[PDB]
Amino acid sequence: DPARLPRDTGPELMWAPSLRNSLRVSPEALELAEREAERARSERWDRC
Amino acid sequence: MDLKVVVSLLYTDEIAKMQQRIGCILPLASTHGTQNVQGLGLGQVYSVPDYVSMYNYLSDCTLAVLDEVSVDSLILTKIVPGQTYAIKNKYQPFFQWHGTGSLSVMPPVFGREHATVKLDIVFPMVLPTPIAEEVLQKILLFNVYSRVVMQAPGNADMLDVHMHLGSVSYLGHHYELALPEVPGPLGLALLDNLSLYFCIMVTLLPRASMRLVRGLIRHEHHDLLNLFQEMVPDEIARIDLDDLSVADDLSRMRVMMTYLQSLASLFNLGPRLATAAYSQETLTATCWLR
Amino acid sequence: MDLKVVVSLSSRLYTDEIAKMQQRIGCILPLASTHGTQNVQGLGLGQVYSLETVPDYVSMYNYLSDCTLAVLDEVSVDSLILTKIVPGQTYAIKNKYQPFFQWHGTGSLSVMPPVFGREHATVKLESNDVDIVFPMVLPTPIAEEVLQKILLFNVYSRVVVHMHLGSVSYLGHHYELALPEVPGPLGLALLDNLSLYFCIMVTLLPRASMRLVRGLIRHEHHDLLNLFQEMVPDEIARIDLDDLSVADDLSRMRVMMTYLQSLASLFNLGPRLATAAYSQETLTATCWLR
């Protein structure tokens, strides 16, 4: 049972949304890294 | 300031039965000096019984603890919210009081013959607040559970509704209640329409809840809790109908709003008295109107 | 105790504004401070209710509960005097309000933001270039009807039945009232708290009362039952399929009556006046603050 919220800021309470309880994700940078690392993984198979 | 109200009108049995109750209260008709006999407590409202109009009459008109009873006059003092008073628990359903507990006044639900003096005079019930809300719940659900088994006897059992409604419990005082085992259908009893109010607001609460939650969610985000508390009800009552006549839905919302406000003011226990120093030795309690 | 607040106007006052203000003597006015003398800014409800098209009634309520209350007794040129309403004193409040609501004998008065228009209850003071508007004082049931009509137009705004909601109906006369379009975040926060209350109602509501009313609609027809049009709602069908149990019902009612008192106090916005002995021949009532 989740609930969806835009924002808050700075609690002492552990289970309480915030800007400090927000995970700093970037979808673009991780996808490029993945796409390039996948290419590296593919090149890793064909040395043996 | 002067505070006495001398009501003019007895004989030896009336002298006795009024002298037993020299510390109880009763409502009046006016805050004036001399009054007639009819203006005394609950005579014109309890003779067909109905809780909502009796509560309206008890909260509307003033209140008065009586002091002395002559052969022909009853010198009594009205209670004003200014100063403090002293009352006694001399009522036929006997509930032991306690210190600094809020005292309420409800119309007499435990029988006309219990709280009266036949010369008429009807005294309202004085009993503390948690016992008041407890016995109010336990007579409301008793009316509902008796009416359903007078409708369909296979729904509930008469002994199953009686082990939890034939007794109240506060602070170890395990009291008992006088329940009408034969209420008679189609109303005509005491608490016969308040249960009829309770069922209508319980019925119309989902139709209000869906319209109200859907009406507020397009008001995008004022807080989290318009959509946070959408998860706590069951999903069956969430997606119920969602198509109805807007005039009929408007009348249903308005009817449930007025029946919610009247029942909410009534479930607030009424003219609340705030006691300070009850003493079970003297059976007295220093109280004031709050 | 001396309650006399003289409000010195910073300029003069013409004879038409004097004759318009002199008709509104005895009407309740709010004040900025509670001190001895005051200037004219902060007087009345006009500082929160600007000369605009958009109203906001709940902000005027939040003003009215915050500020004090006074009665207008003497108005002169360059200065008008007011008499404060402090709790503990008893006042004579005359019924000098143009939408004539007849007052109940010892009922309860209730102050109110101007629901029947800006131009209706106001005085235009070009001389001090401000506006003094007068808060409406109407009895408490009609006040609840007005408040719930405002909230019902606030929730039905995304649906549309208008004149069936946008006009109050009293036995003296039925009256139109001004309907805004959006109360901003404050009226939506009030609806948010009432949505919390309504959704938790449809969580913890009992099921035996639905089982009463489902058979009762099939058994009896009443003015409490005509609005269902002899059609039990589908939620009653898809909730009453379960059985009946008195222990969980007494557990449910011990939170129902616990929440309904706070829901009753969710309609006590704006200060409330407790009246007594209203004479219908002099239109004044010995009233004090509750």
Tab-separated table of C-alpha atoms in Angstrom, chain C residues 1-277:
chain	number	residue	atom	x	y	z
C	1	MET	CA	-15.226	46.343	33.814
C	2	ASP	CA	-15.179	49.004	31.093
C	3	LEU	CA	-15.575	47.789	27.498
C	4	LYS	CA	-15.575	50.843	25.250
C	5	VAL	CA	-13.412	51.098	22.132
C	6	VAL	CA	-13.534	54.464	20.383
C	7	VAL	CA	-12.314	54.292	16.791
C	8	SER	CA	-11.171	57.685	15.558
C	9	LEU	CA	-11.539	58.129	11.822
C	10	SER	CA	-8.509	59.851	10.344
C	11	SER	CA	-10.765	62.047	8.198
C	12	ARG	CA	-14.300	63.446	8.239
C	13	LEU	CA	-17.509	61.711	7.174
C	14	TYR	CA	-20.314	62.918	4.937
C	15	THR	CA	-23.976	62.866	5.910
C	16	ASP	CA	-24.944	59.996	3.596
C	17	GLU	CA	-22.255	57.710	5.010
C	18	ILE	CA	-23.350	58.801	8.497
C	19	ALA	CA	-26.980	57.959	7.708
C	20	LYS	CA	-25.940	54.621	6.214
C	21	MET	CA	-23.817	53.691	9.230
C	22	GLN	CA	-26.530	54.857	11.641
C	23	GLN	CA	-28.871	52.190	10.302
C	24	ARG	CA	-26.262	49.577	11.274
C	25	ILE	CA	-26.207	50.261	15.010
C	26	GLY	CA	-26.206	47.097	17.087
C	27	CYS	CA	-24.658	44.915	14.389
C	28	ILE	CA	-21.592	42.875	15.269
C	29	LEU	CA	-18.263	44.180	14.023
C	30	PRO	CA	-14.792	42.667	14.406
C	31	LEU	CA	-11.742	44.628	15.479
C	32	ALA	CA	-8.010	44.443	14.937
C	33	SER	CA	-6.765	44.785	18.515
C	34	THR	CA	-8.467	44.795	21.920
C	35	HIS	CA	-6.982	48.083	23.140
C	36	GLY	CA	-8.564	51.409	24.066
C	37	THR	CA	-8.510	53.417	20.842
C	38	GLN	CA	-7.938	52.136	17.320
C	39	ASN	CA	-7.631	53.482	13.806
C	40	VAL	CA	-10.102	52.538	11.109
C	41	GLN	CA	-7.856	50.102	9.267
C	42	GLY	CA	-8.305	46.629	10.670
C	43	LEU	CA	-11.915	47.372	11.572
C	44	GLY	CA	-14.515	45.165	9.948
C	45	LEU	CA	-14.008	42.168	7.721
C	46	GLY	CA	-12.799	44.353	4.853
C	47	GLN	CA	-9.049	43.859	5.237
C	48	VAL	CA	-9.325	40.165	4.372
C	49	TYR	CA	-12.307	40.669	2.028
C	50	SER	CA	-10.899	43.115	-0.488
C	51	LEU	CA	-12.903	44.860	-3.215
C	52	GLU	CA	-12.328	42.087	-5.736
C	53	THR	CA	-14.333	39.489	-7.612
C	54	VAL	CA	-12.851	36.454	-5.841
C	55	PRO	CA	-13.930	35.710	-2.254
C	56	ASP	CA	-12.534	33.167	0.181
C	57	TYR	CA	-14.868	32.328	3.033
C	58	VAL	CA	-12.653	30.068	5.138
C	59	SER	CA	-9.953	32.746	5.332
C	60	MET	CA	-12.601	35.112	6.674
C	61	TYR	CA	-13.459	32.426	9.227
C	62	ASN	CA	-9.784	32.147	10.196
C	63	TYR	CA	-9.797	35.920	10.560
C	64	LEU	CA	-12.986	35.909	12.651
C	65	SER	CA	-11.775	33.283	15.105
C	66	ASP	CA	-8.490	35.167	15.399
C	67	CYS	CA	-9.859	38.653	15.937
C	68	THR	CA	-12.171	39.892	18.664
C	69	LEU	CA	-15.815	40.898	18.323
C	70	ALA	CA	-17.620	44.130	19.111
C	71	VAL	CA	-21.053	45.716	18.770
C	72	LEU	CA	-21.656	49.087	17.113
C	73	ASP	CA	-23.525	51.479	19.400
C	74	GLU	CA	-22.453	55.087	18.754
C	75	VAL	CA	-21.310	56.491	15.428
C	76	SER	CA	-20.450	60.171	15.057
C	77	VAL	CA	-18.528	62.234	12.560
C	78	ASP	CA	-14.721	61.704	12.736
C	79	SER	CA	-15.113	58.984	15.405
C	80	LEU	CA	-17.327	55.983	16.090
C	81	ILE	CA	-17.424	54.006	19.325
C	82	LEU	CA	-17.655	50.251	19.818
C	83	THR	CA	-18.364	47.934	22.742
C	84	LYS	CA	-16.186	44.823	22.929
C	85	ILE	CA	-17.510	41.306	23.455
C	86	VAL	CA	-15.248	39.565	25.971
C	87	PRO	CA	-16.250	36.122	27.319
C	88	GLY	CA	-17.757	36.368	30.784
C	89	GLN	CA	-20.068	39.329	30.176
C	90	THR	CA	-23.676	39.309	29.016
C	91	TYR	CA	-24.776	41.524	26.144
C	92	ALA	CA	-27.917	42.731	24.408
C	93	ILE	CA	-27.496	42.025	20.696
C	94	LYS	CA	-30.208	43.463	18.480
C	95	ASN	CA	-31.315	41.818	15.243
C	96	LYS	CA	-30.432	44.566	12.781
C	97	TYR	CA	-29.478	42.336	9.857
C	98	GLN	CA	-31.209	42.934	6.528
C	99	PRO	CA	-31.653	39.280	5.370
C	100	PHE	CA	-34.132	38.694	8.143
C	101	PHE	CA	-33.526	35.364	9.823
C	102	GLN	CA	-36.026	34.907	12.641
C	103	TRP	CA	-34.232	33.973	15.838
C	104	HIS	CA	-35.060	31.008	18.054
C	105	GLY	CA	-36.074	31.310	21.674
C	106	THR	CA	-32.830	30.673	23.645
C	107	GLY	CA	-31.161	29.139	20.602
C	108	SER	CA	-27.586	29.832	19.532
C	109	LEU	CA	-26.302	32.617	17.309
C	110	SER	CA	-23.329	32.286	14.995
C	111	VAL	CA	-21.250	34.909	13.241
C	112	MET	CA	-20.492	34.546	9.587
C	113	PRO	CA	-18.612	36.027	6.648
C	114	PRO	CA	-20.957	37.929	4.312
C	115	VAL	CA	-22.584	35.230	2.230
C	116	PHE	CA	-25.302	37.434	0.710
C	117	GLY	CA	-22.922	39.744	-1.120
C	118	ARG	CA	-20.309	42.410	-0.574
C	119	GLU	CA	-22.579	45.320	-1.514
C	120	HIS	CA	-25.402	44.034	0.689
C	121	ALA	CA	-23.665	44.281	4.088
C	122	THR	CA	-21.191	47.144	3.756
C	123	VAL	CA	-20.684	50.864	4.130
C	124	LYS	CA	-18.669	52.740	1.515
C	125	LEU	CA	-16.294	55.178	3.215
C	126	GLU	CA	-14.696	57.257	0.479
C	127	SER	CA	-13.705	59.869	3.070
C	128	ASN	CA	-11.250	57.525	4.787
C	129	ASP	CA	-10.906	55.621	1.436
C	130	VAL	CA	-11.530	52.239	3.101
C	131	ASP	CA	-14.511	49.891	3.329
C	132	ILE	CA	-16.201	48.565	6.448
C	133	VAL	CA	-18.203	45.419	5.812
C	134	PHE	CA	-20.409	43.760	8.370
C	135	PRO	CA	-20.224	40.054	9.250
C	136	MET	CA	-23.537	38.242	9.084
C	137	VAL	CA	-25.050	36.994	12.346
C	138	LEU	CA	-27.549	34.188	11.783
C	139	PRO	CA	-28.741	31.288	13.959
C	140	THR	CA	-26.649	28.149	14.150
C	141	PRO	CA	-28.810	25.639	12.134
C	142	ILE	CA	-29.171	28.036	9.206
C	143	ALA	CA	-25.439	28.737	9.554
C	144	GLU	CA	-24.727	25.016	9.236
C	145	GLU	CA	-27.017	24.897	6.194
C	146	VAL	CA	-25.132	27.798	4.592
C	147	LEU	CA	-21.739	26.244	5.387
C	148	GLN	CA	-22.686	22.854	3.981
C	149	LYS	CA	-24.223	24.508	0.905
C	150	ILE	CA	-20.915	26.293	0.305
C	151	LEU	CA	-18.954	23.047	0.701
C	152	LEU	CA	-21.418	21.174	-1.515
C	153	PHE	CA	-20.982	23.760	-4.252
C	154	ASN	CA	-17.233	23.441	-3.728
C	155	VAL	CA	-17.314	19.692	-4.346
C	156	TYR	CA	-19.937	19.672	-7.130
C	157	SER	CA	-17.996	22.255	-9.175
C	158	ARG	CA	-16.289	19.645	-11.352
C	159	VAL	CA	-19.579	17.822	-12.015
C	160	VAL	CA	-22.148	20.163	-13.581
C	161	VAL	CA	-29.015	21.509	-9.812
C	162	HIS	CA	-27.354	24.874	-9.256
C	163	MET	CA	-30.343	26.798	-7.890
C	164	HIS	CA	-31.289	23.724	-5.854
C	165	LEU	CA	-27.951	24.239	-4.073
C	166	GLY	CA	-27.107	27.917	-4.518
C	167	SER	CA	-30.091	29.253	-2.565
C	168	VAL	CA	-30.820	28.876	1.136
C	169	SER	CA	-34.444	28.346	2.182
C	170	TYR	CA	-35.879	29.676	5.442
C	171	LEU	CA	-39.467	29.929	6.668
C	172	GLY	CA	-39.280	33.722	6.563
C	173	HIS	CA	-37.979	33.759	2.967
C	174	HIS	CA	-35.637	31.774	0.763
C	175	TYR	CA	-32.450	33.654	-0.101
C	176	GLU	CA	-29.778	33.478	-2.770
C	177	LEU	CA	-26.141	33.524	-1.684
C	178	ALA	CA	-22.924	34.351	-3.506
C	179	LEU	CA	-21.202	31.272	-4.908
C	180	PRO	CA	-17.448	31.521	-5.572
C	181	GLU	CA	-15.538	29.104	-7.782
C	182	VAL	CA	-12.444	28.064	-5.778
C	183	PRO	CA	-11.535	28.606	-2.105
C	184	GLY	CA	-7.836	28.231	-2.792
C	185	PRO	CA	-5.735	26.026	-0.517
C	186	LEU	CA	-7.652	26.758	2.698
C	187	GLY	CA	-11.112	25.552	1.652
C	188	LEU	CA	-9.420	22.600	0.014
C	189	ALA	CA	-7.551	21.942	3.274
C	190	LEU	CA	-10.877	21.990	5.120
C	191	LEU	CA	-12.226	19.568	2.506
C	192	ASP	CA	-9.027	17.540	2.962
C	193	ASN	CA	-9.625	17.134	6.697
C	194	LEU	CA	-13.293	16.379	6.074
C	195	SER	CA	-12.201	13.859	3.420
C	196	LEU	CA	-9.968	12.160	5.987
C	197	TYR	CA	-12.942	12.067	8.320
C	198	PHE	CA	-15.355	10.718	5.686
C	199	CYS	CA	-12.950	8.072	4.398
C	200	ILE	CA	-12.182	6.870	7.901
C	201	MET	CA	-15.963	6.801	8.471
C	202	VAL	CA	-16.398	4.448	5.530
C	203	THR	CA	-13.585	2.348	6.926
C	204	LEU	CA	-14.907	1.873	10.435
C	205	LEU	CA	-18.665	2.029	9.834
C	206	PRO	CA	-20.661	-0.922	11.226
C	207	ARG	CA	-22.433	-3.469	9.072
C	208	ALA	CA	-25.438	-4.446	11.200
C	209	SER	CA	-27.032	-1.051	10.635
C	210	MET	CA	-26.776	-1.612	6.891
C	211	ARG	CA	-28.427	-4.989	7.476
C	212	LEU	CA	-31.146	-3.104	9.345
C	213	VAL	CA	-31.752	-0.543	6.620
C	214	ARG	CA	-31.607	-3.054	3.737
C	215	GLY	CA	-34.477	-5.077	5.128
C	216	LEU	CA	-36.069	-1.892	6.441
C	217	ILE	CA	-36.280	-0.316	2.990
C	218	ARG	CA	-37.842	-3.621	1.956
C	219	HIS	CA	-40.047	-3.471	5.081
C	220	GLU	CA	-40.923	0.174	5.707
C	221	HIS	CA	-41.209	3.407	3.749
C	222	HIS	CA	-40.346	6.652	5.509
C	223	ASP	CA	-39.253	10.218	4.866
C	224	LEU	CA	-35.854	8.979	6.029
C	225	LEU	CA	-36.119	6.311	3.308
C	226	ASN	CA	-37.848	8.043	0.380
C	227	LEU	CA	-34.575	9.475	-0.946
C	228	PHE	CA	-33.340	5.976	-1.820
C	229	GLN	CA	-36.404	5.713	-4.127
C	230	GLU	CA	-37.063	2.150	-2.847
C	231	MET	CA	-33.723	1.030	-4.291
C	232	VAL	CA	-31.197	-0.319	-1.801
C	233	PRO	CA	-27.728	0.839	-2.899
C	234	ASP	CA	-25.371	-1.754	-4.317
C	235	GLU	CA	-22.805	-1.164	-1.558
C	236	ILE	CA	-25.391	-2.385	0.956
C	237	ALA	CA	-25.685	-5.546	-1.145
C	238	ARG	CA	-21.929	-6.097	-1.434
C	239	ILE	CA	-21.258	-5.359	2.246
C	240	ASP	CA	-24.275	-7.087	3.862
C	241	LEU	CA	-23.198	-10.448	2.384
C	242	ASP	CA	-21.072	-10.926	5.505
C	243	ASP	CA	-22.507	-12.025	8.838
C	244	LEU	CA	-23.339	-9.967	11.926
C	245	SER	CA	-21.243	-9.826	15.097
C	246	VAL	CA	-21.923	-7.651	18.122
C	247	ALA	CA	-18.365	-7.551	19.508
C	248	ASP	CA	-16.805	-5.972	16.427
C	249	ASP	CA	-19.821	-3.656	16.240
C	250	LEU	CA	-19.184	-2.390	19.763
C	251	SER	CA	-15.538	-2.050	18.807
C	252	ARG	CA	-16.567	-0.023	15.748
C	253	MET	CA	-18.966	2.257	17.614
C	254	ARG	CA	-16.297	3.093	20.199
C	255	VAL	CA	-14.368	4.772	17.386
C	256	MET	CA	-17.484	6.082	15.597
C	257	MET	CA	-18.660	8.197	18.529
C	258	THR	CA	-15.036	9.103	19.227
C	259	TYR	CA	-14.638	10.595	15.755
C	260	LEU	CA	-18.066	12.197	15.441
C	261	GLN	CA	-17.342	14.670	18.258
C	262	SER	CA	-14.260	15.903	16.415
C	263	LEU	CA	-16.293	15.974	13.201
C	264	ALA	CA	-18.801	18.169	15.034
C	265	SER	CA	-15.936	20.427	16.018
C	266	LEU	CA	-14.922	20.533	12.340
C	267	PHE	CA	-17.955	22.815	11.822
C	268	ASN	CA	-17.348	25.185	14.758
C	269	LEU	CA	-15.321	27.602	12.628
C	270	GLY	CA	-16.259	31.162	13.378
C	271	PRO	CA	-17.056	32.098	16.975
C	272	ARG	CA	-20.409	31.059	18.377
C	273	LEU	CA	-22.870	33.109	20.423
C	274	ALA	CA	-25.121	31.533	23.057
C	275	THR	CA	-28.352	33.509	23.299
C	276	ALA	CA	-31.291	33.635	25.696
C	277	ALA	CA	-34.744	35.256	25.895
